[PDB]
Design a protein around this ligand. Structure first.
Ligand SMILES: C[C@@H]1O[C@@H](O)[C@H](O)[C@H](O)[C@H]1O
Lengths: 171, 171, 171, 171
């Protein structure tokens, strides 16, 4: 029974989320990770990224009339991880086959032509390491890109390239 | 006031679609139309567009393991309409809420920072008139942008702007 | 918002209900509809159902000491909707995690082994459509069984099977 | 096989109606609503009211030799609405001047010495609201009583009084 603090995660309170209204739950341990980009603009400061997180959830919540930001987590270019729906709540990020069986982490920006900075990559890698220590993810979890399970350009070409490389990436 | 009074459409046999395997049906008349873009490349001849439609199909069926190409109808900048799942089959284009109550029409190409040629826009408007003529769509149907319903950049800044002038666009 | 009135709801005064003492409001628009059964007697006439409404409220106020009938609405085999706590007041129908965030409509009877008549089902879905028309319910509202959010047989085997069938039903 | 009938209209098949052989259509949007009475027996349960709708249609078809029950809709004191000829098919309720420019709805009973229960009056207004939404009625529809248009004691003195207090009524 180990309690670690791998959570260097910015809580929703800290980026000033609107109250989530989602109630459906994931079953631990989750087996799949789906990587996305927002396709939107990036941020490289804790301050600008809290704005970017609020903007993204605002779109999902107010325009799209959803129960919260779709992702389980957002990764920023400031090297920080933004608690989305977090580990226990079913996301809305890859459609009805994958949503119940996966975590959706998404990078804030458009990686069709940029590559994300090493510290975003590190954040993401670290987040996954956390999930495993927590029991949230299977230690042998698989990683898919967003375009691999759904018809989109997301996560972007350069990022898609990078994630194809990853240890836990699969087909 | 007699039968088939609408729509010039390239059938599946004609662009060499793989066999549809979709069973689920739409209940007509249909209220909503969701406008899309493929985000991929465009095509300006019957030759290349009949070619594009297969790519798209190929991707949705082979890579994603779907029963058929996700859209009900594809528009080409050749100025023709490629038959997707068609008027009667539930499509896969807008997630679980919009799919069973709408028709997904996808303009082949990426219209973030280019426009479809007048001929493409006519194909699609004409298709819509045709859908009313056949009682496949309600007379007072509503047009939505893909992004009004899913987090995506589709149908692209340029198209999105154009479709908002449409007689049938509702927010 | 928009004045056009809705549904054929039998008002409290009409079924001779005791006064409500409930004071808590529900934030509009509401996202969830929770469907339950009364597990009490059924009725099939406006006369016998007004009666039924009364015993259920009577049993809720007099015995359980709640402020009012626990449901937001009651449905008769009558084919009519009985006004319970209404659109605006928080119910007592699915526990504290689910009360503040949903409408509870209960069918009057025991549907483990009986099916409700078309008449009842129409009234129910109609009531929901008004919710939407009035802005009490989200356009994208979600219907859940009682069974899905608490450990109970409610709303009975047969009726549960029917609501699984509805457009707005969610896992 | 989609969402049902605003106003909880009882379908033809549900009250066991002889098949219609009417063909004249009604030009939507219709402006007028003539309100009549049956001048037959009333009914106050769904069981007795389906039986009554059945009786009056049988009289109209078998005896008078009409193509269907003369009314577009019938209202029971069970407080339900019985689909007659419906929104689209010209009625036979108010003679040649008025049949092609009217929905005619009839209360089942004789309202010379009786008033209909508020549930019937509610059912009737509800049916009208659902007329506009559908687009079968001009949003600014005008209501007349049967006797304002043909020489007759229908819809009965007691009911006629009520009708006059309605907002959309024009002497
Ligand atoms: C992506 C998709 O979006 C909406 O249509 C639905 O809310 C669904 O839950 C989600 O998976």
């Amino acid at each position: 029974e180990d309690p670690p603090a791998c959570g260097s995660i910015v809580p929703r309170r800290e980026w000033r989320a609107l109250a989530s209204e989602c109630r459906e739950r994931l079953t631990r341990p989750v087996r799949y990770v789906v990587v996305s980009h927002t396709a939107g603009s990036h941020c490289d400061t804790p301050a600008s990224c809290a704005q970017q997180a609020q903007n993204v959830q605002s779109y999902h919540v107010r325009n799209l009339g959803w129960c919260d930001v779709g992702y389980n987590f957002l990764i920023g270019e400031d090297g920080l991880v933004y608690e989305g729906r977090g580990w226990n709540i079913k996301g809305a990020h890859a459609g009805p086959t994958w949503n119940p069986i996966s975590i959706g982490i998404s990078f804030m920006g458009n990686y069709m032509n940029r590559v994300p900075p090493p510290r975003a990559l590190r954040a993401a890698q670290n987040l996954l390491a956390c999930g495993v220590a927590l029991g949230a993810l299977r230690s042998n979890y698989e990683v898919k890109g967003h375009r691999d399970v759904q018809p989109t350009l997301s996560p972007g070409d350069r990022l898609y390239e990078i994630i194809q490389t990853w240890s836990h990436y699969r087909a």
